[PDB]
Structure 1
Amino acid sequence: MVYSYTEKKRIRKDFGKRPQVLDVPYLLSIQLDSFQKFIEQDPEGQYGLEAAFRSVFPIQSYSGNSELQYVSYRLGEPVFDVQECQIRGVTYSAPLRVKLRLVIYEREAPEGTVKDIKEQEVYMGEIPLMTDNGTFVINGTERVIVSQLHRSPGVFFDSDKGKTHSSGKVLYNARIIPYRGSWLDFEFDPKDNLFVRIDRRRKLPATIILRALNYTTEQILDLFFEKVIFEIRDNKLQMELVPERLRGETASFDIEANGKVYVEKGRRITARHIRQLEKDDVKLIEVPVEYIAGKVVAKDYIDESTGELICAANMELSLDLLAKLSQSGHKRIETLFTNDLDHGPYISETLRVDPTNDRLSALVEIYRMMRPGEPPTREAAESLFENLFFSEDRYDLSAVGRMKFNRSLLREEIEGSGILSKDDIIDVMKKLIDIRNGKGEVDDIDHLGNRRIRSVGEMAENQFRVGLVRVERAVKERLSLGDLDTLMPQDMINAKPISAAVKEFFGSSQLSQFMDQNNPLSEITHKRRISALGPGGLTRERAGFEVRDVHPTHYGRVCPIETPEGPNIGLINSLSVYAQTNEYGFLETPYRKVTDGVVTDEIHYLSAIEEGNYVIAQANSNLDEEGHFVEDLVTCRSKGESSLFSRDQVDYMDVSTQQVVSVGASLIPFLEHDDANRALMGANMQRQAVPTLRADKPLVGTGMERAVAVDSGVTAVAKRGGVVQYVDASRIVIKVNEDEMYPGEAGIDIYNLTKYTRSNQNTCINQMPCVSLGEPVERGDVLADGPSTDLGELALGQNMRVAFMPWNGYNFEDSILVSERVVQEDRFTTIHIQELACVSRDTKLGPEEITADIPNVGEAALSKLDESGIVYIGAEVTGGDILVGKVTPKVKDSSLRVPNGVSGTVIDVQVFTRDGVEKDKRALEIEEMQLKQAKKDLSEELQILEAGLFSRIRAVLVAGGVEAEKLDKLPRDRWLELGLTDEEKQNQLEQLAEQYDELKHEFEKKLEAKRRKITQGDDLAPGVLKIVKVYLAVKRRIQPGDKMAGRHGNKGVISKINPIEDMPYDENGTPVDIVLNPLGVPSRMNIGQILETHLGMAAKGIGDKINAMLKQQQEVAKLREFIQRAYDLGADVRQKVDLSTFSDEEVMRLAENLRKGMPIATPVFDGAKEAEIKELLKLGDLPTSGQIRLYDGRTGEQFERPVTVGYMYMLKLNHLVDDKMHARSTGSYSLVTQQPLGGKAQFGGQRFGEMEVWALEAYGAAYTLQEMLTVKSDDVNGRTKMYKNIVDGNHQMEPGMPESFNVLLKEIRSLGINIELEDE
C-alpha cells in the first residue's frame, strides 16, 4: 500500500476488518445536485426554471387574441464576490433575464399575426447563488436550507381502530393528495355508505361525482356490481346460478339438477359441492320466488307492450313486480350480485342516500356546495368542476405523483396525465370497496415509500411559480387593457411581486436556518438534516408517538440515533453516511448482490418498497473471499423481520457496517458497546463543540476524520497537481505540473486564507498553513488547516490523561475535577469575536456625526479614541470604554460604548455611507489599504503571468535573436526592438506583445474595477447615511461551571482548579489531567468510554516509547523495526503500511508526528476487540488490565488497589459559565407594565415563575411573597420608598398596590364590563 504526501505524515493505525468496496460518498451531494438541477437552463422541459415557465406560459388574453410566449432565459454574473457581498452585508444574488414573444393575432380571419415582437431581454429577478460550500449568503448572513420530509403526492388508504364512532366498527379512509391543488377524500360511513368530500368540506355521497362524470345509475351499477340473473324458463323465473358464488353459503331450499339434489335448506355449501354443481350443469335453478323478491333489481325496465316505463334500478324486488315485468313480456330480470360480506351493497346503499339523479343536479349540487349561497349556472358549474381536478393550473400531479399513483393501482404502466380521469377515480373507489370487502390492505403512512424528500431546488421552484401566478393577474388585465401596439413586455410584467416571493421565502421560511457555524462538524451535519416540519409537513406538537418512533424502513437510510432532543425528537433526522436520493426524491441506499453462491461487488440503490421483495444479509456477515458466506446460513432481514437464511437463499448484502449511522454518530468509537441514550447525547454534543486554540487531533478515531474535513470545505484543497512555493500564513501559491498546465495559462494557482472572522456563533474561523515552500502536493491534497483540523483530520477537542475514582466529593455526580496544569497547558483556551456597529441617524433635531468632542466624558476614554472619534485597531477595552464617538445635538453623547461586564481587544473597522456622503481619514486609509492589497495580489499574479510570458520570449532567444550574454538586461519589453521583418523571432515578439498588452489591460481593468467597487458607497437603509463596524476579540480560559462533554454521552460541568501537587499521580511521577466520577458508568451504561481510555492509554505508550528513541539518538533501524511491528500488530486487520519504502526521511517526519501518540482508527461497528487491545498494552508499557496504582498528591500515600487510568478525547461545549451567569440588583422597567425588563441582552431581572409562587405559598411565609411582588416587581412608590429605607437601614416596606392590577382593571373596564373596588 502507498499513500500521498499529505497522508504520509500521520498514517492512522487501523483495526477495521471488513474490506469495504464503496468509498464514502461526497457529503453535500444532495444540496449541490438539487440546486444545480434547479438552476441550469436545462433545455428539457422537466424541473428547473424552464419547467416552471413551460407550466405557466404561454399567457394570453381573450381580449385581443393576443399573447406573450416564452423563450429561454439568461443568468447574469453576481454583482460582487462572496466576501465583498458578505462584507457589504447583502445577499449574494444573481439576476434573471429572459426572452419572450408578444403577439397580436388577426380578428375576423384565420388567426395569423397582426403583430408579434420578441422581447428585448426583459429582466426581473434576483436569486441567491448556492455558494461553493452549498450555503446561501443572505444580507449580512449565511444560511442553510434544510431538506423537508413530507407526505408524498399519491393516493392513500387508511383505517381507524377504536376511533370508529365508538361502535367498535372498522372505518376505512382513502385520500388523493395532488402535487398541487385540491385534496380529494373518500370515506366509509359508520352506516357503511360511501361518501366523498373535497378539501375537507362537508360530507357528500360519492355517487354525485359519478353523475357529474355523466354516468347513469345502471352504468354505475354495471361498473361496480357483478350481475345475478333470473329468467322465465318453462316456469317462474329460474336463477342463472354460478355455483362458485355459493362460497360459504347455506342453502335455504333444494338446489337440484339432472335429477340430483346437491343442497337443501339448512345445509352448507363447499368447494367440492360446487365442483359437482357446475360440472353437472346447474346453470338454471328455480329458486323459491320469495328468494327472488329479496334481491334488488339491477336495471330500470319498460312495459314495451304499452310503451311504458315503470321499474327503477336499485329498486328492491317483490312478487308483484315479478308479475309486472312478466306481464310486460320480459324473459329475464337482472339483479345485482351481492353477498353480506363478499360483495357489499355500498354503492346501492349510497344510491338510496343520494338525492341527486341527473348530471344537471350533480353539477348544480356540487357547485352549490363549492359556492355556498351563490348563483348556479350550468356552464359555470361545469367550468368550476373542470378547475377542480382537470386543469394543471388548479390540480396537478407531478411525474412522481402520477408514477406513485399508478403504482398504487398496480398499473404496470407508470406514466399518465397530471390531471385525473374517470377511470382513475373508479379504480381508487373500487380499491376502497375491495378493502371494505376484506380483500384489500391499508398503507403505512410512516413507511418511507409513502414519504419523499424535498430539497432547496424543488422548493424554490414552487415558490418561484407562485410568484408567476401573482404576475398572471397583473399581466392578464394589462394585456386585456393594453393597446398592444406600443406597449412592450417590460411594461406588462413588473419585478416587485416575483422578487419578494423568493426574497421573503429565503429570509422567512421555517426551513431557512441561520447556520450553526459552531464548528466544522456542526455545519456539515446541520446541512444534511431532514425535517418533517414546514408547509406540507406536520407541526412540532401534532405528532403521535408512532410517527416519532423509528420505523423499520429507516434502516440504512435515516440515522435512528441522531434525532435531537426535545419536541424535535423523531421530527428532525439526518441522512445515513451512504444515503442517496432517487430521481423521484425517494431516499435510497445501495446494496450488494448475492450472485448465486458468491456475494458480488455490484451495487444497486433501493427504496423501501423495493427492499420488501428481497432478503438482505447483515453487513458484518463472514464470507470466504469468493463471496460465499462462511456459514451455510446467515442472519438477514427479509421484510424487515429478522431471520436466518441459507447461502444462495439470501439475495443481497449491505455494503458497509457504517451504512446504518450518520456522520455525527460515526465519529464515536466503540459505539457498538454503548447504550443508545448516551450515544444520542454524544452525537448532538459533537455539534455543540467549540474549537480550541491548541487543537492537535483525536487519538482514538473512527476513520471519518479525513473525509469530514475535506468535504466540509473549511480546509484548502489542491485543485491541481503541483508543488508549493510561498508562505505568508495569509496566502498559498502552487506551481502545477505540466500535465495540468494549460496552453494559454499561467501554470500556477494561488489561494488566500480566511483569517480571524466572527462565525455565525461569534467564533473565529482563521485558516492555517500545513506545508512549506518547494513541497509537492497531489491534486485534492489538503493545503491549509482550518478550525478544529490538523493535516486535514477533524480535531474537535483534546486527548486528556484521565482516571476514574471518587475524589473528596469534588467529582460527585457529573462534576468533573480539573488540574491547574491543563489551563496552563492551554488545552481548552478559546477565542471569541464580537461585532459592534453604530449608525448615524437623520434625527429631526439635527443629524448625527462622529466626533472626538464628546460632551463631558473623561479624558482617558477620549484618549482611547482617535481624533476621528474612533478607537484604534489593536486597542484593549473594558465595559464602558468609548468605541464610537457619535453624538446628537441638543449636544449629547449618543455614542457607542463597550457593554458592561466584558473586556476584549479591538480588531476591525469597516465604514459605510449612503450616496452623497463624505469620508473620514480612517475610512479613506482603510479603503485605500484594501485597494493596495488587491493590487499586490494582482501584481504577483501578473508577475508569474508575465514570467510565463517572458519564458516564451526567452525560450526562442536561445536560438533566435540570441543575446544570452545580456539576455534580460535588454528589458523584456525592449526585447521587441529587434530590427527584424516577419522573421520567426519577430513574429513571437510582435504577436506576444499584443497578448502582453491585453494581459496588461486585464490587470488594469481588473485593478480599476476592483478599486471602483471598493470606492463606491452603499444603498443604506433610509434615515441613516453612514455605518461603522467594529469587531472585538475575547480570549477565554476554563472556570468552574463550564460545561464539558466526552464523546460517549458523558457530559458534565467542571468545578475546581487544583494545585498540581494535589492530583493523584502514578509511580512514574506523572499526574492525571482529569478525574471522573466512576459511578456514572453503570448508571449510564456507556462502557465503551472505558474501552476508549484503555486503547488511548496504549496509544500514548506507543508514542512515548517512540519519543524516547527519538529523544535518544537511536538509529533509524530501531525506529523502522519498532514502528513496523506496531502497525502489523493485531488480528486480520484490513490496513497495512510499507515504511521501508519511505526514504528514511519521511520516516523521521512520520515518526516525529507519532511521538505525540499513536493515532488510531476504529470503524463504528468493526472496531478492535479486547484481545487485540491486550496485545497492544503488552506491546506498550502497561499491564493488560490497564489499571494502575496511584498516590494521593496531598499525602503521598498509595490509594487502595489499582484504578482505571487512561487517555480520553474530551470536548469543550460552547456554554461556558461567564456567557450565562447574570445578576441584577436594580434597573429600568417596561413602559406597558412597570415590571422589570427581561433577559441578559437588556439588563433584565429574573422571572419569579408562577409555579414557584405555589412553592412559596406551600410554606406559611406571606410577608416574603408580599415583598416579592409589591416591592420587587410592580410598585413604583413602594420600591422607591424601599430604596430609601434600605439606605436608612430600616429594611421595611410599605404595602403599596401592584400597578399591573390597575392595568388589568382598566382593560376590563375598557370592555363592556363595569368593574369596581369595594371599600366596605
Structure 2
Amino acid sequence: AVGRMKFNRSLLRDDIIDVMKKLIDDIDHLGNRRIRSVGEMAENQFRVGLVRVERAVKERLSLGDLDTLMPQDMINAKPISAAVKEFFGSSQLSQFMDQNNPLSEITHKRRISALGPGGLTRERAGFEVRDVHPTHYGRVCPIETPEGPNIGLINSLSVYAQTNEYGFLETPYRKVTDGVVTDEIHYLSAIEEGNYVIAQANSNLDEEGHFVEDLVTCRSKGESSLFSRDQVDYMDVSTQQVVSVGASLIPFLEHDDANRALMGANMQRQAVPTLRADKPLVGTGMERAVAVDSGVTAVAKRGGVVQYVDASRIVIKVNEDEMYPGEAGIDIYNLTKYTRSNQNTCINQMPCVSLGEPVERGDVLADGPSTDLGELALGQNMRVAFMPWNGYNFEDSILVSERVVQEDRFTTIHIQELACVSRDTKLGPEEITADIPNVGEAALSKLDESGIVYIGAEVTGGDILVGKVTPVKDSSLRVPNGVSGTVIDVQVFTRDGVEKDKRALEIEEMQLKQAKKDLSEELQILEAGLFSRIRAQYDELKHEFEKKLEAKRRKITQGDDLAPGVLKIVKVYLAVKRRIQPGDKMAGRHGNKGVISKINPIEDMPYDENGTPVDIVLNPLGVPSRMNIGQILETHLGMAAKGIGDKINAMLKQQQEVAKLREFIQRAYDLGADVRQKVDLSTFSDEEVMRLAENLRKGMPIATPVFDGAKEAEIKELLKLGDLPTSGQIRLYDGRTGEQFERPVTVGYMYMLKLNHLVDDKMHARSTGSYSLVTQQPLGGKAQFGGQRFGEMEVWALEAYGAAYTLQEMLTVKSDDVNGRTKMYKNIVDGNHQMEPGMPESFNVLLKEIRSLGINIELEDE
C-alpha cells in the first residue's frame, strides 16, 4: 500500500511502460526509505508460516474427501511456531538487549538499523549512506552513531521523532500564521517539509508570539538562509528536537565538538550502577523522562495513600474516586531485588516513599538501578581539580583520592549465574548426590544435604557449588577460577515426569514453600479488606481465595519443560562487589575518558584553604587538545551548585528559622537572566520546605537543556550567590608539602561515570593449555583460556629487529611444534632450557589441503 502510493507519487499518477517514459525523459533521502518495526516483521514471519501451512493444506486436500475434510487435520501449527521461534531468537534484528543502565535500554529500544534481512551490508555500504543528510534533522540523531564499521548505518531515533501511517519518519513543527507562531503542531515528513520554510527554535519571540528580529534565520529546500517574517511557515518545536535521548543528556553540548559528544553519548551507555545512585548536580532535565520511561522504577498506577512500605514490597490504598466498583482497593508493587542483568550487573529497586505519604498517579514509588528519586543517576558527582600531579594523570590518566575508595562511591555489585545440568546416561555413571568420591570434608560440609551449596555462603575459587560425579570422576559444578562471591540465590528445575530425589525434593519443596508463602501472604493482604467489608458472601469469598491459592500452588509446582536428555538443572547465583582499582576506565558525559592510575592517600591530595581535598585530579592538557569545553563549563556550574548546597547545609547544621531557608532558596531559584522556571516557595508548607532543603543540602541540581543551557554570566552569578570566586579557580595547596600551587586551579564538581571496562575482567595471562585440533595452536579467547595472536605485523616487527631466535621460538616452540612444545616444557621446568624447533603442524595441514586439490607438493630432501 505504501509501495503503491510511492509508485503513484513518483510517476505523478501499462505500469512498466510509464517507468520507461519518465526514464527517457538521492536514495539516501528519507522519502525513499521507510521504517519497519517489530510488528511488521512479525507479521511477515507469520505470513511465511501461514503460506507454508497453506501449501501443506493444499497438498493434503488435493486428494479430496466427502465429509472427511475438516479444519483440524488440514493445518499444522508446527511450521508457524518454528518460523516465529526462529524470528524471535535468531533474526539479525532480534538482539540481546543492552542492560547496563536505563539509558542503554532506552537507546536500544529506540535504535534504528539500516542492516538486517532485506537491507544493506556494512562492507558493501559506501560513504553516501553513512553520512548525515539534510533529512536527518529531527528524525535521526546526527551525533550518536557507532565508532566501528557500523557508523552511519546504525542510527538512533530523535526525541520528538514519530512514524506516520505509511512508515515515514516525521517531526513536530509549530505552525506559523501571519507572522505569529501558533501553538498548534503539525507533524511533517522529509518530502513534506522540503517544500516549506522552517524557522529555527533559537528565534526570539514577544508575548503575543511575533518574531522579535525583523529577519529570522530559516531553512528551505535542504539549505539554511535568512528569511523575513512573512515567508516563515513553520518553526522548530524545541532545541532538543535534533539530538537523541542519549545525546540530550549531555550538559553544555553546544560547547563540544560532535566527535566528543558522540563519545560521551556512547560512554553514557556502559555506565555501571553503583551502590548508591547519586543525582547529577549539572543536568539537562531529561533524566526524569528517561528514568520514568525506562520502566526500571515502580510508578504508581493509581493515586492513593501509601499503606505498607518495605524493601521488598509496597502497598497503596487507592483513593475513593480511583477504585473500580468490583475492586477491593489495594495496589501491590513487588520490587526487584538483586537480580542478574544481561551484562551481569545488578537490578535493584528501593522504595522512595514513606508510610502514609500521599501519592498521585504517575509518582515514582521505587528507584531502579542508576535512579535517584525518579532521576536518572548514571554516576557520582566528584570534586575535580584540573592540574598535572607528578605525571599520575600523564596521558589522559586519572588520579583518584583514597576517600573515594573508602566511601564506596564507585563500588558496583555484579551477579554471576552458574548452571549445573544433569543429563541422562545409560548405566547411571553420572551422580548428583551430595556424597562424591574423593571430596574434602570441608567442601562436603559446605554443600547442604541435597548436594547444593547453602544460600549466603562465601565461595572462593576451586569450590564446588553442586555435587556431581560421573564415570566415577567428580562432575560437580564449581567456580572456574579466581571469581569469588556469595550465594544469593539457588534455583532447581525439574520436569513434570523427571524423577525427583528426596534430598532434591527437600530443596525444591523448600523453595516452593517459600514461593507459596509469599503468594498466600500477598493474596491475604488483599483479602483482608474484603473480609473486613463483609464484617460490616463470606463463604463465596473464602471459596474464591482457596481456589486462587490452589491455582498459585499448582502453577508453582508445575514441572518445567526441560530439554530432552537432561533430568535436573540447578542454577547458582553469585554476587560480588567490585571496588575501583588502578586499571578501571572512568569517563564523563563530554567525551573525556581515562584509567585510574593511582589511589592517592587523602592527605597527599591537593586541598583548599578550608582543608577540603579534591577527589579527582585531571590533566588540563586533555581539554584544549580535544574540543570538550563543556566539561570545564559543567565543572564551574557544579562548583556553584555545590556552593549553594553547602550554604543550605550550613544553615541546616545550626538551627535556623524556616523563613531564612525559604528566602535563600527562593533567591537561588529566582536567579538567572531569564528562566521559564518559576519556583514559588510561598505555595509550599513548612514541612515541604524543610524536606526540600534537606534534599538540597548536598547540592542544588541544575538543568541546562542542550542548545539552551546556562550562559557564562549566569554561572558567574550562581558562583557569586554561593560566596565563590567568579573565575571558577581557587588557590590549592600541595598535600605532601603544604606549599601553595603557583597558579590558581579550577576546582568544581563534574559528574563522573564508571564504565563496564574493569581491569579484572580484562587482565589475563596464559602459560600453557588446550590447543586446537585442526591446527595445534593455542585457543583464541580469554574464556577459552587462550594465548594472544602474534599477527603478521608483529612478525614484521621482529624481522625488522632481526630477532631470528625469538621469532623462531614464537612460531614453533610456542605453537604448532607438538614435540617441540613437549620437550620445551620439560626443559624450562628442569631449569636447563634448550629447544629444537620442528615443522609446524599448520604447514602439514597446508600440504594436505593442497594435495587434496590435486596438486602434488612435496619436501625435496636435496
- Give the TM-score, by structure 2 length: 0.98
Query: Is the contact made by 2:179 and 2:232 (CA closer than 8 Å) also made in structure 1?
Result: no
Query: Is the contact made by 1:594 and 1:648 (CA closer than 8 Å) also made in structure 2?
Result: no
Distance 1:764 1:923, change over 3 A: farther
Distance 1:1000 1:931, change over 3 A: farther
Query: Is the contact made by 1:557 and 1:575 (CA closer than 8 Å) also made in structure 2?
Result: yes
Range with bigger deviation, 650-659 or 838-847: 838-847
Query: Is the contact made by 1:559 and 1:660 (CA closer than 8 Å) also made in structure 2?
Result: yes
Quick one: distance in 1 between partners of 2:456 and 2:527?
A: 38
CA-CA distance at 1:848 after TM superposition: 2.1
Query: Is the contact made by 1:789 and 1:796 (CA closer than 8 Å) also made in structure 2?
Result: yes
Quick one: distance in 1 between partners of 2:623 and 2:519?
A: 60
Residue 409 of structure 1, aligned match among 3, 8, 11: 11
- Could you report, residue by residue, the CA deviation over 1:376-416 in whole angstroms, capped at 9, with x for unpaired residues? xxxxxxxxxxxxxxxxxxxxxxx1111111111223xxxxx
- Could you report, residue by residue, the CA deviation over 1:1086-1131 in whole angstroms, capped at 9, with x for unpaired residues? 1111000000000000000100110001111111111111111111
Query: Is the contact made by 2:531 and 2:538 (CA closer than 8 Å) also made in structure 1?
Result: no
Quick one: distance in 1 between partners of 2:470 and 2:421?
A: 12
Alignment-derived partner of residue 299 in structure 2: 717
- Could you report, residue by residue, the CA deviation over 1:309-360 in whole angstroms, capped at 9, with x for unpaired residues? xxxxxxxxxxxxxxxxxxxxxxxxxxxxxxxxxxxxxxxxxxxxxxxxxxxx
Matches within 5 A, 1:113-262: none
Residue 430 of structure 1, aligned match among 18, 21, 29: 21
CA-CA distance at 1:997 after TM superposition: 3.0
CA-CA distance at 1:486 after TM superposition: 1.5
Alignment-derived partner of residue 1018 in structure 1: 560
Quick one: distance in 2 between partners of 1:934 and 1:738?
A: 32
CA-CA distance at 1:885 after TM superposition: 1.0
Distance 1:475 1:931, change over 3 A: same
Query: Is the contact made by 2:516 and 2:556 (CA closer than 8 Å) also made in structure 1?
Result: no
Distance 1:877 1:936, change over 3 A: closer
Residue 1276 of structure 1, aligned match among 809, 818, 822: 818
Distance 1:840 1:937, change over 3 A: closer
Range with bigger deviation, 1279-1288 or 1212-1221: 1279-1288
SS at match of 1:403: helix
Quick one: distance in 1 between partners of 2:532 and 2:545?
A: 19
- Could you report, residue by residue, the CA deviation over 1:844-871 in whole angstroms, capped at 9, with x for unpaired residues? 4534221222222322222211222221
CA-CA distance at 1:937 after TM superposition: 5.0
SS at match of 2:217: strand
Distance 1:739 1:1139, change over 3 A: same
Distance 1:1210 1:931, change over 3 A: same
CA-CA distance at 1:1185 after TM superposition: 0.3
Query: Is the contact made by 1:1274 and 1:1298 (CA closer than 8 Å) also made in structure 2?
Result: yes
CA-CA distance at 1:1292 after TM superposition: 1.4
CA-CA distance at 1:1190 after TM superposition: 0.7
- Could you report, residue by residue, the CA deviation over 1:686-718 in whole angstroms, capped at 9, with x for unpaired residues? 111111112221110101011111111110011
Query: Is the contact made by 1:949 and 1:996 (CA closer than 8 Å) also made in structure 2?
Result: no
Query: Is the contact made by 1:763 and 1:832 (CA closer than 8 Å) also made in structure 2?
Result: yes
- Could you report, residue by residue, the CA deviation over 1:1156-1193 in whole angstroms, capped at 9, with x for unpaired residues? 10111111111110111111111112111010111111
Alignment-derived partner of residue 474 in structure 2: 893
Quick one: distance in 2 between partners of 1:1309 and 1:424?
A: 57
Range with bigger deviation, 666-675 or 904-913: 904-913
Distance 1:1289 1:823, change over 3 A: same
Quick one: distance in 1 between partners of 2:108 and 2:683?
A: 42
- Could you report, residue by residue, the CA deviation over 1:955-974 in whole angstroms, capped at 9, with x for unpaired residues? xxxxxxxxxxxxxxxxxxxx
Quick one: distance in 2 between partners of 1:1274 and 1:844?
A: 38
Quick one: distance in 1 between partners of 2:598 and 2:422?
A: 47
- Could you report, residue by residue, the CA deviation over 1:234-293 in whole angstroms, capped at 9, with x for unpaired residues? xxxxxxxxxxxxxxxxxxxxxxxxxxxxxxxxxxxxxxxxxxxxxxxxxxxxxxxxxxxx
Aligned length: 861
SS at match of 2:600: coil
Query: Is the contact made by 2:635 and 2:749 (CA closer than 8 Å) also made in structure 1?
Result: yes
Query: Is the contact made by 1:927 and 1:1015 (CA closer than 8 Å) also made in structure 2?
Result: no
SS at match of 1:612: helix
- Could you report, residue by residue, the CA deviation over 1:876-912 in whole angstroms, capped at 9, with x for unpaired residues? 11111111111113x2211111111211111221111
Query: Is the contact made by 1:1064 and 1:1190 (CA closer than 8 Å) also made in structure 2?
Result: yes
SS at match of 2:314: strand
Distance 1:798 1:921, change over 3 A: farther
Distance 1:1101 1:923, change over 3 A: farther
Query: Is the contact made by 2:645 and 2:698 (CA closer than 8 Å) also made in structure 1?
Result: yes
SS at match of 1:592: strand
SS at match of 1:1066: coil
Quick one: distance in 1 between partners of 2:503 and 2:650?
A: 55
CA-CA distance at 1:471 after TM superposition: 1.8
- Could you report, residue by residue, the CA deviation over 1:509-557 in whole angstroms, capped at 9, with x for unpaired residues? 1000000111111001110000000122101111111111100011111
Query: Is the contact made by 1:467 and 1:501 (CA closer than 8 Å) also made in structure 2?
Result: yes
CA-CA distance at 1:929 after TM superposition: 4.5
Quick one: distance in 2 between partners of 1:427 and 1:885?
A: 75
Distance 1:922 1:514, change over 3 A: farther
Query: Is the contact made by 1:851 and 1:885 (CA closer than 8 Å) also made in structure 2?
Result: yes
Residue 804 of structure 1, aligned match among 374, 386, 400: 386
Quick one: distance in 1 between partners of 2:542 and 2:775?
A: 68
Distance 1:1137 1:920, change over 3 A: farther
CA-CA distance at 1:927 after TM superposition: 4.2
Query: Is the contact made by 1:592 and 1:603 (CA closer than 8 Å) also made in structure 2?
Result: yes
- Could you report, residue by residue, the CA deviation over 1:561-610 in whole angstroms, capped at 9, with x for unpaired residues? 01111111100111110011000000011111111121100100010111
Query: Is the contact made by 2:817 and 2:837 (CA closer than 8 Å) also made in structure 1?
Result: no
- Could you report, residue by residue, the CA deviation over 1:19-40 in whole angstroms, capped at 9, with x for unpaired residues? xxxxxxxxxxxxxxxxxxxxxx
Range with bigger deviation, 843-852 or 1266-1275: 843-852
SS at match of 1:1152: helix
Range with bigger deviation, 920-929 or 719-728: 920-929
- Could you report, residue by residue, the CA deviation over 1:632-664 in whole angstroms, capped at 9, with x for unpaired residues? 110000112111111122111011111111110
CA-CA distance at 1:770 after TM superposition: 0.6
In structure 1, the gaps of 5 or more residues are 1-398, 412-422, 435-443, 955-994
Distance 1:549 1:708, change over 3 A: same
Quick one: distance in 2 between partners of 1:858 and 1:1309?
A: 54
Quick one: distance in 2 between partners of 1:997 and 1:700?
A: 59
CA-CA distance at 1:916 after TM superposition: 3.1
Distance 1:1196 1:952, change over 3 A: closer
SS at match of 2:753: strand
SS at match of 1:839: strand
CA-CA distance at 1:744 after TM superposition: 1.7
Is 2:249 aligned against 1:667?
Answer: yes
Quick one: distance in 1 between partners of 2:519 and 2:123?
A: 56
Alignment-derived partner of residue 945 in structure 1: 526
Compare relative contact order (CA 8 Å, sep 6+) and give the higher one, 1 or 2. 2
Give the root-mean-square deviation of aligned CA atoms: 1.5
Query: Is the contact made by 2:302 and 2:361 (CA closer than 8 Å) also made in structure 1?
Result: yes
Query: Is the contact made by 1:910 and 1:923 (CA closer than 8 Å) also made in structure 2?
Result: no
Distance 1:1317 1:1065, change over 3 A: same
Quick one: distance in 2 between partners of 1:1191 and 1:952?
A: 70
Query: Is the contact made by 2:515 and 2:556 (CA closer than 8 Å) also made in structure 1?
Result: no
Alignment-derived partner of residue 854 in structure 2: 1312
CA-CA distance at 1:933 after TM superposition: 4.7
Distance 1:1102 1:925, change over 3 A: farther
Residue 903 of structure 1, aligned match among 484, 487, 492: 484
CA-CA distance at 1:952 after TM superposition: 4.2
CA-CA distance at 1:1303 after TM superposition: 2.3
Query: Is the contact made by 2:61 and 2:69 (CA closer than 8 Å) also made in structure 1?
Result: no
Distance 1:1259 1:952, change over 3 A: closer
SS at match of 2:170: strand
Range with bigger deviation, 1106-1115 or 856-865: 856-865
CA-CA distance at 1:1008 after TM superposition: 1.2
Range with bigger deviation, 944-953 or 1076-1085: 944-953
- Give the TM-score, by structure 1 length: 0.64
Distance 1:595 1:933, change over 3 A: farther
In structure 2, the gaps of 5 or more residues are none
Distance 1:634 1:1299, change over 3 A: same
Quick one: distance in 2 between partners of 1:942 and 1:877?
A: 37
Query: Is the contact made by 1:746 and 1:944 (CA closer than 8 Å) also made in structure 2?
Result: no
CA-CA distance at 1:831 after TM superposition: 0.6
Quick one: distance in 1 between partners of 2:270 and 2:524?
A: 45
Query: Is the contact made by 1:934 and 1:1010 (CA closer than 8 Å) also made in structure 2?
Result: no
Alignment-derived partner of residue 930 in structure 1: 511
Is 2:540 aligned against 1:998?
Answer: yes
